[PDB]
């Protein structure tokens, strides 16, 4: 159907079915250096996102359901507005200021989970 | 609390709660080449460790409990000394000579586990 970013204007729940479409598009000596820098950067950016998913316990997934509650102060909206009316670009603007808080919480709940699972073994 | 390597002088069980602190810090043409080599190497070293965890069945984890027994000949100490008195730098010296043996055993038990799990499906 749609190709890369074709779902950008779609709602969040219509999109998020195309996650593999975007994931797969992330992959004279002076010209050689400029291009190696571009390629090295693409790899480094990719790996930082993968490392981050790993420490949150979401390695290998495109959709990862976590064990952190949603604070209503981050966005006081119902699922109907978020998944049926909004697009991902709009959502990203709405909660930009809470991104680092959420990320810190995700890392911490994984550290606790990982240890509890060791004690049970 | 502590930042990168701040737990280096702490005991092994006090440390190992800071694993994400260290994991996240691993990420004129002549100057361009020297820096690309440094960046390419950082990526290659990172990936070798990740590949190794993968073949041992520990992908995506910071703490991975395996199915290999500990030979008392590698280190004849009780959990109390290892986790409460020793630091990781001291431990690394103590068992340096057994690292390759342990790694070989981890790879082999994973190969057997992976096959048994196929036969059960």
């Amino acid at each position, epitope marked *: 159907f749609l190709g890369f970013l074709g779902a950008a204007g779609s709602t969040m729940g219509a999109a998020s079915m195309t996650l593999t479409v975007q994931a797969r598009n992330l992959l004279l000596t002076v010209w050689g250096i400029k291009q190696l820098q571009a390629r090295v950067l693409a790899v480094e950016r990719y790996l930082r996102d993968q490392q981050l998913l790993g420490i949150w316990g979401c390695s290998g997934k495109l959709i990862c359901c976590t064990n952190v509650p949603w604070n209503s102060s981050w966005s006081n909206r119902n699922l109907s507005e978020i998944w049926d009316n909004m697009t991902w670009l709009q959502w990203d603007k709405e909660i930009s200021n809470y991104t680092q808080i959420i990320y810190g919480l995700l890392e911490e709940s994984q550290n606790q989970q990982e*240890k*509890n699972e060791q*004690d049970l*073994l | 609390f502590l930042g990168f390597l701040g737990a280096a002088g702490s005991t092994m*069980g006090a440390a190992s709660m800071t694993l994400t602190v260290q994991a996240r810090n691993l990420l004129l043409t002549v100057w361009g080449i020297k820096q690309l080599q440094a960046r390419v190497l950082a990526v290659e070293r990172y990936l070798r460790d990740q590949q190794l965890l993968g073949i041992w069945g520990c992908s995506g984890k910071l703490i991975c409990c395996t199915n290999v027994p500990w030979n008392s000949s590698w280190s004849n100490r*009780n*959990l109390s000394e290892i*986790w409460d008195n020793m630091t990781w730098l001291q431990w690394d010296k103590e068992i340096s000579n057994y690292t390759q043996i342990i790694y070989g055993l981890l790879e082999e038990s994973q190969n057997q586990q992976e096959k048994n799990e196929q036969d059960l499906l």
Partner: antibody, heavy 124, light 109 residues
């Protein structure tokens, strides 16, 4: 020398609720797992619940599994046990004890090292 | 759970044995069988843990062992001060963590 002191009400109606607690001292509270054990008025000992040293993992005997909650606060050195519903069969002395589990990075216990004196709870 | 209902007795200086019988998916498979001493009206004290080990502060008059699915507590130089109820318990795996037997009353003659 360590101490474990149980406190809490001792008389309830069936169908109600009761919260017991246990104050600890003389040892690092946070280094040990803890549990509750009942002494029936005229019989033996029964294990009821167990909580991990960090408070994240709890276990229960089937007979109270849907009724009791075990909780821990390491900043106050206390345990608590919240009983709900309550049956006549729950009349017992409830002992606070240290032990029961382990933390997998230290030697195991699987036994109880210290006991308090016990709170007496009667269901009418 | 675990069983041993009878009273147990003997004269000062005589040894006595207190049994504790369980099953295979219990006492047979796990070596975690502690023993507790309780004088009526008092909280229990740990006497033996794991199988044979005693806590510091516990005298050498108390020892124990196991065979098959049966564990036992041995009291050697029996004293009048041993008049207490004795209980055995065991780790019975995950899900069912602990079980206890009824205890036995030790009478010194």
């Amino acid at each position: 020398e360590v101490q474990l002191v149980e406190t809490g009400g001792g008389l309830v109606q069936p169908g109600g609720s009761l919260k017991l607690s246990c104050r600890a001292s003389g040892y690092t509270f946070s280094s040990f797992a803890m549990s509750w054990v009942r002494q029936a008025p005229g019989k033996g000992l029964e294990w009821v619940s167990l909580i991990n040293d960090r408070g994240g993992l709890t276990f229960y005997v089937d007979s109270v599994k849907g009724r009791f909650t075990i909780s821990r606060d390491n900043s106050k050195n206390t345990l608590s046990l919240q009983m709900h519903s309550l049956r006549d069969g729950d009349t017992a002395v409830y002992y606070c004890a240290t032990g029961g589990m382990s933390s997998a990075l230290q030697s195991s216990k699987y036994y109880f090292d210290f006991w308090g004196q016990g709170a007496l709870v009667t269901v009418s | 759970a675990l069983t041993q209902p009878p009273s147990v007795s003997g004269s000062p200086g005589q040894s006595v044995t207190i049994s504790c019988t369980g099953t295979s998916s219990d006492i047979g498979s796990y070596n975690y069988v502690s023993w507790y001493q309780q004088h009526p009206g008092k909280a229990p004290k740990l006497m033996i843990y794991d199988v044979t080990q005693r806590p510091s502060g516990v005298s050498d008059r108390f020892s124990g062992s196991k065979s098959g699915n049966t564990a036992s507590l041995t009291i050697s130089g029996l004293q009048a001060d041993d008049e207490a109820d004795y209980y055995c318990s065991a780790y019975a795996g995950r899900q069912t963590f602990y079980i206890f037997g009824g205890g036995t009353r030790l009478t010194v003659l």
